[PDB]
Structure formats: structure tokens, C-alpha cells
């Protein structure tokens, strides 16, 4: 009871979203991909050509090659006791840029914007992110906000 | 304004429903009556109880427009004595009927060729229905611009001095 | 005790459940009467078979009719046998109902005068069912969703329109004109 055809068990994985069938938005074809870009793989069931295998659906990797209609994407997959370099040729309908990559780009930009300004003002810059610190001391007032005393409620059937 | 009902197309179809020498002579008379080539309607699907030949010509019809369409309609009413009933008119504003013994129309006849029946179906359209028929920017006609049965009956009674059955 | 296994194209060869009638008494009643409802609820997850339900409904119909008549009760069976229990013949064997905790098994709305009678009939049906069940008195009017106090106010304002056994409850939604005509005595207050 187990077939190993390419698209076995992809019944929901390769479905277009509800009320998202039909036309493919043409901005997908106008995106530019360069070697070193970090892309997400997300299979469009409406484009049967250039389909990556279902293992790569929802995976993120680096573009190593650019062709007319496709990109080569480097993906590491565990195959035993080690990761293996996989090179998947994907048509650009199944690919999108990682949104964190622009977030990392902008954070670095803001880091150097802070660093240069801190240098000129002759002060520290403190470019390190920090985990959410313990909450600080405050002074909750009760004027016009008097405490309400609660009690546990008695049991009663609501059917 | 431009809310003028006029004839869009007059369709005339043989009601004989036979394939053979009668079918061929039906094309000739359809050609004579219209001045146009009688394209052959086909049999969509064969039936076990009738044995209609698949993808073979069974009926013939032509589409007629223009001023000669009114003439064909006028000579159809004249042989119909300008008498049609209420239920003929369709819910979308079209009307039609059917007359046997097409000899009664003004075409010379001989008893050799055969007797054929010839029907009428007049499609009614105000100007501006091109909106729903053009390929580009194809819209939908507004509700008030559509044609109802009452409108096309009044158009029929406005001219031709016709009357309609009071069922 | 597997995942639900109902009749389907993959399970066409199925027996019919031994219970087919789920409604009893004055089924075509109204809303003004039968104002008090008593429920028999399942206290644990049991698998009541259609035989056990069919046995209960026959017992409940006979006792209730003899004691109060036919026009003073609206007995109905909530549980439905849709799961198919299999067996090896001497393949499907029977139909059972998967009822969770707090699922109503039989609900009867009667008069407040028949409050004690409705309790007793619903109490006897516990001996037919497996597992444990409790008798509770509904805080809702019959088979509606509203409390008795609220339903009274909706009835006194004039926003309730009787439709057979059930009814129509006005809402702030839809074309006004239809709502106006339908509710004659109701006051569409302008705020």
C-alpha cells in the first residue's frame, strides 16, 4: 500500500488556494534573481513544468544558476548521518525571494547608519540586538481605577 | 431616444425533418427564398429509436437580416393573416411561429418538386446590443434596455395592423 | 474504536439501522405550548447502538402516551447511528452512535404541568442505554436557543413569528421592507 510516484501524497500540497485558481499574477515573471539570492520554494500546481519534487516545497535555499525561465537553487537535505548538497532546477513560478533577506539587508544598513553617526558624535553605538529583558519597575495608580474583588463562581447547568 | 425596437435576425428552418431527395430540394427552396447559401444543420447524436445518421445533414436553415428580412417577415404575416397568439412571444422578447404548405407564399410552384414546411423565428434587438456581442470590452446590457414580451407585442401591434389572441 | 467508518462508496454494503423514526408526539406543534424541555444527556463517551436507541424510543413512546396522551409531548431522538461496527461472519455488522460527553440523547418538550412526568419517562430510558446519563431541565424554550425570560420579552414585544413547530426570530439584517411587512405588531424603533 505504498506507491513512490513523484507526486504521491501531494493532494493538498500542490493545490491552489481557495478562490486562487486561474490566472498567475504576472509580477512573478518580472522578479529578478541573481546568484547568491536566498529564495523560498513554493510549488504552483498550475505550472506542471519545472516543478521541484515535493521534498523541496516549503524549503529555502541559495540561487546558484540562472537560465531563461528557471533558477538553480542549492538545498541541503539530510540523507543519513550528513547533509547532501541538492541542486534543484525550478521554474520561477515556484520561487520567491526570502523576505528575511531584505530584513537582514536593511538591519545591516541601519547598523552602519547608526555606527557612522555614533562615531561622529563620539559616542557608543550599541548595535547588538537583545532578548526581551525582564520588565522594569512601574507605579500602577488606582485613582478612578479601584480594584474589583472577584470570587470563584458557583456551578450551574447552562443547557 | 434610441429605444427603437427593430428586427435583429429572422431565422427560417425546415420542419420536414427528413433526409433524402426532400432534404436536398429543401436546400434549393431555402436558397431561393433567401438569396443565401443554405448551411446544413447536423445531427448532434444518433438515436436508437430513430437512427439519425451521425454527422450527416438532417435540417437546413439560414439567417437573414437587413431590409429583405422585413420583407420575408411581412410576407410571412400576410400568409398568416397577421394573427399570432400571446404565448408565441418569448420571455426575452423574441417571437416565432410555423406555417405548412409554403406554396401559399409568393413563389411559383409545381406539384413535382414536393411540399415543404417553413417556419419563422424573429429575434428582436434595440440598438446597443453590440455591447454584449463584440469581442473586446464585452459588457452586459442593462435591465431597462432589455426587451420583454410586452414590449415586442406592442411593437408588433404598433404597425402591421396586427391583433393578438386574448387567452 | 477506530476512526469513523460511515456508509460511503467505499462502504456501500451496509445494513440499515434498526431505528428509522426519530420524531414523536405532536411533531407539528407550535411555540406557545410545550414551553418546558427536559434533556437526557450522555455523561461519558459511549457507543449506543441503533438497537439500543430503537429499544429506548419504543419504550419512551408507549409509556409517555399512556400516561399523558399524544398531544402533551414532543419526544425526539437526537443521537443518530452513523458509525459502522464490523464483525467476522459466523464485514459490517451494525450501526452505532458515537456520542461525546454531554451529548443529548433524547429531548422532550412538554408542559410545565407535565414536568414530573417528563422526568420519569426520561429516567426510565437510562436502563436501555449503556453508560451513564443524567437528566437536566433545559433553560431554553422548547427547542429554541433563547432563555425563558428573553423569549418572553421577544414574544411580548411582538418579534416572533410562528412557523410550524419552530419559528422566525427577527434580526438586524436584510431589506427593511420585508422585515416590516413580516412583523406587523413589532416596533422597528428608530434609536
Amino acid at each position: 500500500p505504498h506507491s513512490y510516484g513523484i507526486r504521491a501524497r501531494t493532494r493538498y500540497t500542490f493545490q491552489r488556494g481557495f478562490r486562487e485558481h486561474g490566472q498567475i499574477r504576472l509580477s512573478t515573471y518580472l522578479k529578478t534573481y541573481k546568484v547568491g539570492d536566498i529564495v523560498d520554494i513554493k510549488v504552483n500546481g498550475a505550472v506542471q513544468k519545472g516543478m521541484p519534487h515535493k521534498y523541496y516545497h516549503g524549503k529555502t535555499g541559495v540561487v546558484y544558476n540562472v537560465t531563461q525561465s528557471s533558477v538553480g537553487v542549492l538545498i541541503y537535505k539530510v540523507v543519513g548521518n550528513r547533509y547532501m548538497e541538492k541542486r534543484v532546477n525550478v521554474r520561477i513560478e515556484h520561487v520567491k525571494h526570502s523576505k528575511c533577506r531584505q530584513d537582514f539587508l536593511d538591519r545591516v544598513k541601519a547598523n552602519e547608519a547608526k555606527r557612522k553617526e555614533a562615531k561622529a558624535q563620539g559616542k557608543t553605538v550599541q548595535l547588538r540586538r537583545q532578548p526581551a529583558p525582564p520588565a522594569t519597575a512601574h507605579f500602577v495608580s488606582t485613582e478612578n481605577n479601584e480594584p474589583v474583588t472577584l470570587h470563584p463562581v458557583a456551578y450551574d447547568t447552562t443547557i | 431616444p434610441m429605444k427603437e425596437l427593430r428586427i435583429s435576425k429572422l431565422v427560417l428552418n425546415i420542419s420536414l425533418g427528413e433526409s433524402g431527395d426532400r432534404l436536398t430540394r429543401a436546400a434549393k427552396v431555402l436558397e431561393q427564398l433567401s438569396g443565401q447559401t443554405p448551411v446544413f444543420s447536423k445531427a448532434r447524436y444518433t438515436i436508437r429509436r430513430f437512427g439519425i445518421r451521425r454527422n450527416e445533414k438532417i435540417a437546413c436553415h439560414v439567417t437573414v437580416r437587413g431590409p429583405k428580412a422585413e420583407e420575408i417577415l411581412e410576407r410571412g404575416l400576410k400568409v398568416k393573416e397577421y394573427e399570432l397568439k400571446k404565448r408565441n412571444f418569448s420571455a426575452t422578447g423574441n417571437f416565432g411561429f410555423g406555417i405548412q404548405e409554403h406554396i401559399d407564399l409568393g413563389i411559383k410552384y409545381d406539384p413535382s418538386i414536393g411540399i415543404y414546411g417553413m417556419d419563422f423565428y424573429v429575434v428582436m434587438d434595440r440598438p446597443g446590443m453590440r455591447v454584449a456581442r463584440r469581442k473586446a470590452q464585452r459588457g452586459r446590457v442593462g435591465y431597462t434596455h432589455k426587451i420583454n414580451a410586452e414590449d415586442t407585442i406592442n411593437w408588433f401591434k404598433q404597425k402591421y395592423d396586427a391583433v393578438v389572441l386574448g387567452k | 474504536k477506530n476512526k469513523p467508518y460511515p456508509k460511503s462508496r467505499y462502504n456501500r454494503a451496509v445494513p440499515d439501522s434498526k431505528i428509522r423514526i426519530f420524531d414523536l408526539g405532536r411533531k407539528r406543534a407550535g411555540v406557545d405550548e410545550f414551553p418546558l424541555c427536559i434533556h437526557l444527556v450522555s455523561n461519558e463517551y459511549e457507543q449506543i447502538t441503533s438497537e439500543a436507541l430503537e429499544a429506548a424510543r419504543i419504550c419512551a413512546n408507549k409509556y409517555l402516551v399512556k400516561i399523558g396522551g399524544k398531544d402533551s409531548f414532543h419526544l425526539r431522538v437526537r443521537a443518530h447511528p452513523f458509525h459502522v461496527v464490523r464483525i467476522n461472519k459466523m464485514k459490517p455488522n451494525g450501526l452505532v452512535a458515537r456520542v461525546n460527553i454531554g451529548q443529548i440523547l433524547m429531548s422532550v418538550r412538554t408542559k410545565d404541568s407535565s414536568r414530573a412526568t417528563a422526568i420519569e419517562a426520561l429516567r426510565r430510558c437510562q436502563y436501555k442505554f449503556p453508560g451513564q446519563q443524567r437528566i437536566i431541565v433545559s433553560k431554553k424554550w422548547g427547542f429554541s436557543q433563547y432563555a425563558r425570560d428573553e423569549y418572553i420579552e421577544k414574544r411580548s414585544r411582538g418579534e416572533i413569528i410562528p412557523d410550524g413547530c419552530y419559528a422566525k426570530f427577527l434580526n438586524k439584517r436584510g431589506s427593511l421592507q420585508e422585515k416590516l411587512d413580516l412583523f406587523p405588531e413589532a416596533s422597528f424603533n428608530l434609536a
Binding site: 537583545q130 532578548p131 526581551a132 529583558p133 525582564p134 | - | -
Partner: protein, 50 residues
Amino acid sequence: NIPPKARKIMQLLRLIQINNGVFVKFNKATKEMLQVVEPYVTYGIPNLKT
């Protein structure tokens, strides 16, 4: 009888033996690690004498 995630977390906490103890700076990252190992450790606020 230590499952893999908790075993790794106690290694990262340098809590390798029973009754071992460490000081940890309390932040959101440390707090979520201690949540995973709640059955295996105990922790609280130490005073100056401690």
C-alpha cells in the same frame, strides 16, 4: 530517562549532574529554555547571602 531536547538544554546550561547549580542571566531566550526543562530543574531568585 532524559529526552533529547531537555538533555541538550541542560548541557547548554552546564547542568550535567544532579544537584549541580549555575547562575543564569534571565531574558526571554533563557526563560523559554527553562520552560522546556521545568520537570528536570528548579530555579528562583537568589539573595546576596546565597
